[PDB]
Amino acid sequence: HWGYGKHNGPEHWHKDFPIAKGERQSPVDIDTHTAKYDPSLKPLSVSYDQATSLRILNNGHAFNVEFDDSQDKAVLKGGPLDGTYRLIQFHFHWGSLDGQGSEHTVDKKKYAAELHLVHWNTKYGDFGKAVQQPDGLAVLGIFLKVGSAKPGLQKVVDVLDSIKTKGKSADFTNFDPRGLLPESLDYWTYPGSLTTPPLLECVTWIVLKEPISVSSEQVLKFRKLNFNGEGEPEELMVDNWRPAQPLKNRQIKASFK
């Protein structure tokens, strides 16, 4: 099945998922000189005070921090969005080395990692219905650079030993995603897709300009995870990023001057 290797990685995905070659694929390179400031864009509203994390999962690609999305508890609104988008999960993409790992790039710069906070449009009732709609999802993307530790990440890092291999999960309650956000909510936005199969073209991307800092030790713990299941040949979970895809007929807009 799909993955990140030589035989199953991104260049192969189109054979099982032909939208991989579609008109609105993600990620993309953000050319900061050509992204236009759009004064009609609103501030983003991130309301995570009542978020209820439940569980962390190793799905064999990344790890997912899952939320209770059965009410309006953790919502994204504003920005480029019409209506209300509910947080369902977050996950990361990262590299084997600090010089790669992000999916989006900024003037071709790759960050060490990228965090995706995934939210679905409440007007479609559930996540599975939302992904079938062009405005079904809003994903908040946040770059990670290596420097000072991010204290709000350490609880995640802590737990990874318990979910080393594919198919392992653990209780992960009371985790506050606010501790993963940068100071500024300035962003770029464009229409795109999920960055893993099924690659559905259902996402309004909101990519924050300001990266977070994490420590080398934090990232090194991500790189000890495994893509394999228990008791299978070890293959370190690294380089689980899709490269930039063609922008095609899209505009990237900036919330800031």
Curated annotation (Swiss-Prot):
What is a single molecular function from GO for this protein?
carbonate dehydratase activity
Q: Which cofactor does it need?
A: Zn(2+); Co(2+)
Where is each Alpha-carbonic anhydrase domain found? 1-256
Q: How does activity depend on pH?
A: Optimum pH is 6-8.
Q: Metal-binding as a keyword?
A: yes
The listed outcome for N59D is: Strongly reduced activity
GO CC term, one of those recorded: plasma membrane
Q: What Gene3D superfamilies does the database record attribute to this sequence?
A: Alpha carbonic anhydrase (3.10.200.10)
Q: What is this protein called?
A: Carbonic anhydrase 2
Task: Give the organism, scientific name.
Answer: Homo sapiens
